Structure formats: C-alpha cells, structure tokens
Amino acid sequence: SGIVQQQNNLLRAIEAQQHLLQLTVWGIKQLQARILSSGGWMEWDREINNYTSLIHSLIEESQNQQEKNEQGGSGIVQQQNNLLRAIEAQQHLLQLTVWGIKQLQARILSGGSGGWMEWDREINNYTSLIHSLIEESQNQQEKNEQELLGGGSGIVQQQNNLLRAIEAQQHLLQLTVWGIKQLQARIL
Amino acid sequence: RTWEEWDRAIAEYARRIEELIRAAQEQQRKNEEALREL
C-alpha cells in the first residue's frame, strides 16, 4: 500500500530528524560549557528534556501504529495525529536550540557580519512557514477525525501537509547546524 | 563523542533525511495520481 508506505516514509523522516535535533542539542551543550558557567539555562535544560521525552513517546506510539497498519482506515488517521504532534514537539525543541544559539552567539560575536543577519532572517521565515504548515495540518487533522465514523481523500492531503512541514523543519535544522558550526570554529 | 564524529553524524543524518524526503515526494505523487484515477 502506497498510503501505509508514505506513513512509513514520514515517520522515518521524523525519526532521523530527531537524531539530527539531538546532535544539535549536544553541540549547543558543548559550546555552553566552554562559554558560560545559568541565566535561563537551567530552565532551558529542563525544557530540552521534557520535549525530548515527549517526542520519543510520540515516535514510539507511531512505530506501534505503523505495525498494526501494515497488512476501516482510522488507524492511519490516528497515526497522522501522532506524526503531527511529533512535528510540533520537534518544532518546540528546535525553537529551544535557536534560543540557545542566540544566547551564545551574543556572548562572543557581534550580530553583524559573518552571515548572521541572513541566518536570523531565514530562521524567522521558516519559523513562520512551519507554524502556518502546522496550523493547516491541525485543521486538516480535525477534519479527517470528523469525516471518519464515517474516504481517504483527506488522508492523502494530510500526507502532503506533513511532508511540507518536515521539509521546512529540515531547512530550520540546516540553519541551526550552520549556527552551531560558526560558534564551534570561533571558540572551540 | 568528538566534534569530528559529530560532523560525520550530522552529514550522515542530513543525507538520510534528504533521501527519505525524496522518497516521500515520489510516493506522494504516486498516491495523488492513483487517487485521481479512482
């Protein structure tokens, strides 16, 4: 089934993005131990942990559902909900890493030069874009959860929405990577 | 880990996501087409 297969492709993208996100959290933590001694970093840490455990739980549940679904179509609407929640949670977590990079960048670099003004613009553009895509997916998701009970028209649409959100998230992840790399070359 | 390892893990995950996204894009088209035929 192409639909089930698409769910698998999305789940696996989220999964791999989750490892990329955790890598950025670590790179930030290294930079933060080199640059600082908390000033909001205690809260930041607790937030990183909270979102990380929630994403894992949503990912695991989506793994559960991927198994059931492989062989009316409610298990795929339900899985879609969890994929959307995983993306929202990842987005929160990525916002945390953005806050972290900015804190550190301000300690050691002026915000002018070096591609930073562009970096800031691009972060704001894709943050707005992924929030709109998330909003569109939530509307679509609520609609799908209504049209069941009780076809797979809004299911394929939702796959499209989730994909676009994933793609915007990837742009944001490439930005945070660039930010972390700049800081690393600078003081590490 | 070291920062050299981190660099490698970053690139590997990025490459994997770009592949997954390319596959998801192709499947999206195949699903939308099959849905148009129906």
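qc> Residues 74-108 of chain A form the longest helix (35 residues).
qc> done
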